[PDB]
Design a protein around this ligand. Structure first.
Ligand code: FAD
Ligand code: FAD
Ligand code: FAD
Ligand code: FAD
Ligand code: ORN
Ligand code: ORN
Ligand code: ORN
Ligand code: ORN
Lengths: 448, 448, 448, 448
């Protein structure tokens, strides 16, 4: 069991964010310290800062009926050690549900179930996690101020409820803050225009009456757009929905066994060793495994609904739920006296008008939010560097004549270009957590 | 094209009922008269009497999302002649939907779609079908009244809208009236106790508010009980449902290829030729193909919903939707001042109380309604016979010294004991229709 | 790690057989003694006697391509404790194969793979397992010979290689010897007539040339008969095969979720508590889950091969591989001067002749071989008892005035009538092993 | 029924090739002339020239177990008219196999079965098909030699058995000759290097002994390469096989419903109307539907075999069957005194040596063989044209002042760039055949 470190003490590690990636590190550290699992093994002074009030995993996209797109074996522990108490199967055993899960004959739990698994995991680390704390900046520190050597970092976080800044000092920092909502530059700001990440949380507040005949539009062609589009038909039974996509069709995610091997934990070494050109070419060739793609079973379900509409009415323009392929939004009118916005559409090749009460935007995420937190440490990078360069062990490159060997900053979840498509996913977290514990607490736990 | 016969004329054939079975005969006759399909081929004087106001197929069980449990190839024509204009594939071509159906990659259309196919078929016979006519009795006739030989039949039908009796005379009669709702003898009569056959038609009238937290019970363990039970959770989102069954579990329908061969049109010969003991033993050994069984995909779907309830709440007694296996109803209290009935339950081996607003009873059908229509012709059977004995060609056995060779009565859909499990189904209708046309219009069309 | 007990010492436990059932006990004991898994925990003196020269699992039926009919989660440890080092997933991790297994997206490993898993398990108990030892009898013993109280058992085993009898004394005995080959009484003894259990081991010796056009017959309609029949077509490409069954068709195994719940470890309590009549009726109602049934995917594969034969030749009598349903063997001629036997066939209802080089008999197993080993202890049963009566904890009932409380005999794998259909299977072994350790070593390990 | 035209007579139509594409035209013409199907309808003088001795469909790739990659509904007639006697379902009915096919529950017949269907179709046109005739050139003709107007074409064909040239004159020509084997330019000519199209025909002649331990290599990553690679393991049980591909993995064919709509017969209009840039971009975006892709079920099967090899031996270099991704052939040594060639390999990014008895090359086809047959008619194209420009109705553009309106040349199966990915496939053949009959025999059959 991990014990709390007083705020005023110098930490060994401070992690920013407590989502899956950070939780995987916490679990890996527990396991590395467990004399039952690690026969070799003073507790390291560790703390996790999370802006949410309690543990949650993409709560705004927890659509009813939504399933995991990954095998349960690729949970937070199994691929590193199946004997771990933090496995999904052990979770089910602790819940009295293992025999019942077995009878489902599925590798893909509901997202709701997998979130509770991770919640059950996270709760066992409550003593070392500070919730309601949003990190605003990371600042370099010098134990000897008159020297020119940085040997610690001050991490400042704002309390979400109360608003005051708190400071914690640490030798090492991990940033695992996921991504920020990516919005098209052409779209204007409006409370009726909502990103996919806030679908379950903000949309019901805007459209209070669930029986009212609303017009709701969805922009995108990926898993989130398909999930939202399909869900709206259940959540708002009398609403007219529209899916808008640049591509000609919803295209299936590629989970075929040979292609799927790029997500193997050991393939991170092979991917990282490749040159920039070889890494850029590889990500593009395997784009159908993660980006702008939908699980085949969802596509088929949607297509079936589209076919039943055809049975009832051969006239496509009369359909309650429609898909408009090869379209882009030219302009949005949202200053009119009516409840609805006017969306203007044209061909996406190098058209109609829609009037809608709400526009759901499922255009993915940006993984650049760490830049804002690390502006004050940019000068510690090697001369001329304008991007953070993560090593194989995820430790960012810094000038060794400016930064002590005991001090470092690690990045997690934003290292796709260097580590592969599995970097932002749950695929390698169990193994990566294990690697991270070794990279950070290596020398400290070698003597045991 | 088949033309109408004036009511006052002597018919060659009169069919009672215009459901799938009778429709299959009509289609087979059209095809036998089509010089394009039948190279050998005065039109026979034919009329169909149907009690419904227009063509419908189990409308009270047309659950949204419900699928066919039979391959579309086993439609009303294909197995007899794929070149027929009455095939499901030709229907889709006429509707502009064939390419769209192909992309679904399914042999199992929605029940809604298949009903429209049969509707599209039936509408082409509107000139020879009298809707809104319920047959009340079949009476024997003698062209020479002083003789002791029956050579025609008078069929009397009551108009459902207006109530008056009409009489039509014919040499030959087909009875294809399906089955009547089978209700348990222990259950009392109550408007809150409804048979599965009236689920979509009468239940919404009883429970007007779709958002109200009702308690609704379902009795049975077959396809209809599972379909109703699963549907209620969608149709009444806030209702507490209960499935009550005598058996320990929902058991899957057997559609495995070798076992499924009993439904082959040619296997009717082999089944019919078997003795009474061999026929009784065969039906029991293949009971899992049709009776008290559910499509595996529906069972799995229901089980998944049951599992998600377990994820949210480990306490089974708190669940919104529950299944109570190995239970029987001992008594029903329905005279109380409250809106709900009290259902008392005990073990089905040789318990609780439920309070419900509605009880859905899915206990199948009886195939004995033809007996009431043929009471006045019973004396034409061979001496000592107290059951109607259908030949291989479905023509009931009558005393040849009392009934002329040109006169006869045929039975359809109630001949399971003699013809097999496929008799009540859509399995052999295309071929059976063809056989029926030959049996009835054989000598009349042999000269062509 | 479990250490060896000298032959001459009084044992706490002696297990007869080292198949899955006994291996599950060994694993459960290791786990109960592991202070990492069991926080409470002198080693108990234990020994396993196995007649085979090394660990094997139905080697004569290890057909190439054959799969497990059970989810890998129902391995030898997971359902009791997923943290165990003896889980299938931990096995794959130790073999460097876990990521590769995950990509298969299957719960059903090849029988070859699962056997190696169990081999990998068994090898860790080599110090407490005596291979090449066939138990011939269990004899009661009295530490005080002049008393009338039995407090130990002598177990005598014959060395298979050398032939001499060895004696080991123990307070408690487990008999987990599986089943003996069940052969029809009408069939005569012949080297060309081989039981399914010796298919992979004895048949290749009889039919040495794999390219020779043999006639090979298979008797049965279950999983083993289907597996052998399908395999012969690959193993002997030029041979004429024949499947002979009493039933009209191959019928599928029922693995539907609600019915499958009878295999739950907790349902053993509910099944055991039921009366003899309720237990007899329950086994018969769920017969399609284990007995005379074939995995649907195998049936479909076989049917497809049968269909391709029809494409090439419409004449069924000319087919290389044929299925003869509703047939029984009346007599077998095997004294003729030719290489082939003559099998005479008739209808199985209350016919042809086959000439074959080999007859494979897949008619299941008997679970009564323990009777022969326990004849000398029969007099210790309560007066009038002529069958062994196993308690819930599998300990057979004995007269408490004749047998001390520290002495007992346990049965495993033959308790279907009292414990359910899962008794002979791998379904509950993990949990049953755990229960067995508690029943046997309860008082001995309570002080820890 | 279509009757033969004497060789010396002027034909209305002459078709080059009698594969699926030409067969579809023949069937469409039969149907357009059938007064049963076409209510409006002297027979047109038509002849088909085919170089094979009898009807065959990719005989060199008729791998045992190989399935169709297209739904049977997309046969040679159904999508145009389901009432046609040339439908796959009618074929099965004529063969007595329709009920048996239904029980398979598959849209994908074996390639062997579908070939026999097309054979059964083709045989009904034997009177208008000249087999054993290879067309060597098409020459323009002038009924008035002194004029400057071409109004007919002479088609010259060489008899394959006897070698002499025959000439047939026609107003209109269709070229439906499929594609020629595409071979990499770096590979030298050798009898041990065989294209996929000659796998079933020439490889068994080269490797006579099926039990001999050969080394066999397969170059490619598409359906044919996967099929050959998987088949070799069955056909040569003791051989060491190697799959060589430039890509990192076998990638699955995309048959998802929305993407699959590009293969719709009506989408040919939409595709054709698009500009050259829009057509080039569309083919590339949907490349995963036809090119360098494998049916998912085959990939999974291959992967499973690869996994079983891992179970038996963790050492990948020791495996009997191996896949070498991201490799290209640099040089081939084939002049050595040994039976085997030496294949040198390097990385395909911008290595080992293999010694093999045979190299199977599955690198697709070229669709440019029509160019050689039309060299003498090139001058009839509009000035400056160096490529044949097919109209929507497939009629190539010619100078209207040089070619009469009654004379024309049509292309089939090579029009991908203008008509879409379905052009070379079986997808639109039924409809295209119908369109072709109208384009060619339009004015001739309008008066009926
Ligand atoms: C709808 C949806 C479904 C998905 N399903 C799958 C799937 O099936 N399989 C799969 O492999 N991947 C899936 N993913 C991908 C997903 O990114 C990963 O599963 C996972 O969320 C990665 O975890 P993370 O910790 O890197 O990022 P996150 O899960 O986003 O966690 C980051 C955490 O940091 C916190 N944080 C952010 N900023 C600050 C700050 N300034 N201060 C303090 N804390 C902060 C956030 O509150 C958050 O809790 C899915 C993504 C979405 C959107
Ligand atoms: C919910 C449900 C789903 C089913 N799905 C399938 C399936 O997937 N596949 C399958 O093979 N089978 C299925 N069946 C079985 C079904 O019985 C047959 O498909 C089919 O209905 C048989 O047709 P029929 O004409 O014999 O009987 P019916 O369809 O019942 O037709 C009888 C007709 O006679 C009329 N009639 C009755 N009495 C009189 C009277 N006195 N005078 C005049 N007219 C009268 C009725 O109005 C009715 O129209 C299903 C049954 C149910 C209840
Ligand atoms: C082909 C086949 C496939 C199967 N597949 C499955 C499956 O997928 N899933 C499933 O749940 N079940 C399956 N089973 C059922 C099977 O019975 C169990 O999986 C398992 O074998 C039960 O283990 P056991 O120890 O009870 O019996 P066994 O496995 O038979 O082990 C008994 C052991 O005792 C030894 N022995 C016997 N007599 C003596 C003696 N006199 N002295 C000393 N030693 C002796 C034997 O050599 C043997 O090693 C299958 C059975 C067969 C035949
Ligand atoms: C292994 C394989 C599997 C396939 N499976 C599918 C599938 O599942 N679905 C699908 O849609 N497509 C499939 N195809 C694509 C295939 O191209 C089409 O199915 C089909 O063959 C197209 O017919 P065609 O007439 O255009 O060409 P072809 O089938 O090649 O027919 C051309 C004919 O012209 C003849 N010919 C050639 N030159 C001359 C000459 N000089 N004189 C006279 N005659 C000549 C040839 O002998 C041949 O018979 C497959 C292709 C291959 C190689
Ligand atoms: N969208 C998440 C992709 C998961 C990946 N196919 C994997 O198996 O790891
Ligand atoms: N419930 C209808 C059964 C249909 C049958 N399996 C058939 O294929 O004909
Ligand atoms: N033939 C073995 C049956 C296994 C059983 N269905 C189970 O899941 O335990
Ligand atoms: N490889 C042939 C592709 C067939 C295509 N998916 C179709 O449905 O027409």
């Amino acid at each position: 069991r991990l014990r709390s470190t007083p705020q005023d003490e110098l930490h060994d590690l401070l992690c920013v964010g407590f989502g899956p990636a950070s939780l995987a590190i916490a679990i890996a550290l527990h396991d590395a310290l467990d004399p039952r699992l690690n026969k070799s093994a003073a507790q390291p002074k560790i703390c996790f800062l999370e802006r949410q009030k309690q543990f949650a995993w993409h709560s705004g996209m927890l659509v009813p009926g939504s399933k995991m797109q990954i095998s349960f074996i690729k949970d937070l522990a199994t691929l590193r050690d199946p004997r771990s108490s933090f496995t999904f199967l052990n979770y089910l055993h602790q819940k009295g549900r293992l025999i019942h899960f077995t009878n489902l004959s599925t590798f893909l739990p509901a997202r709701l179930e997998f979130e509770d698994y991770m919640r059950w995991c996270a709760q066992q680390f409550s003593d070392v996690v500070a919730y309601g704390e949003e990190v605003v900046e990371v600042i370099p520190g010098k134990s000897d101020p008159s020297s020119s050597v940085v040997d610690f970092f001050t991490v400042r976080s704002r309390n979400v409820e109360t608003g005051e800044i708190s400071a914690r000092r640490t030798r090492k920092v991990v940033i695992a803050i996921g991504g920020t909502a990516k919005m098209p530059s052409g779209l204007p700001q409006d409370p009726r225009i909502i990103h996919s990440s806030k679908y379950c949380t903000t949309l019901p507040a805007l459209l209070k009456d669930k029986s009212k005949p609303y017009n709701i539009a969805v922009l995108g062609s990926g898993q989130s757009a398909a999930e939202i589009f399909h869900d709206l038909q259940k959540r708002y039974p009398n609403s007219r929905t529209t899916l808008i996509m640049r591509d000609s069709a919803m295209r299936p995610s590629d989970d075929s066994p040979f292609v799927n091997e790029i997500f193997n934990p050991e393939r991170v070494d092979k991917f990282y060793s490749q040159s920039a050109a070889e890494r850029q070419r590889s990500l593009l060739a395997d784009k159908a495994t993660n980006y702008s793609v939908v699980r085949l079973e969802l596509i088929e379900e949607i297509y079936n609904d589209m076919y039943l509409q055809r049975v009832k009415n051969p006239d496509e323009t009369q359909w309650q739920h429609r898909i408009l392929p090869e379209r882009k939004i030219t302009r949005v009118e949202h200053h009119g006296p009516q409840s609805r916005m006017r969306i203007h559409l044209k061909s996406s090749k190098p058209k109609e008008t829609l009037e809608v009460d709400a526009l759901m935007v499922a255009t993915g995420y940006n993984r650049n939010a760490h830049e804002r937190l690390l502006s004050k440490v940019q000068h510690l990078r090697p001369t001329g560097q304008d991007q953070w360069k993560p090593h194989r062990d995820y430790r960012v490159e810094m000038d060794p004549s400016k930064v002590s060997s005991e001090a470092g900053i690690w990045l997690q979840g934003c290292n796709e270009r260097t580590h592969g498509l599995s970097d932002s996913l749950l695929s390698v977290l169990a193994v990566r957590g294990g690697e991270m514990v070794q990279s950070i607490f290596g020398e400290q736990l070698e003597r045991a």
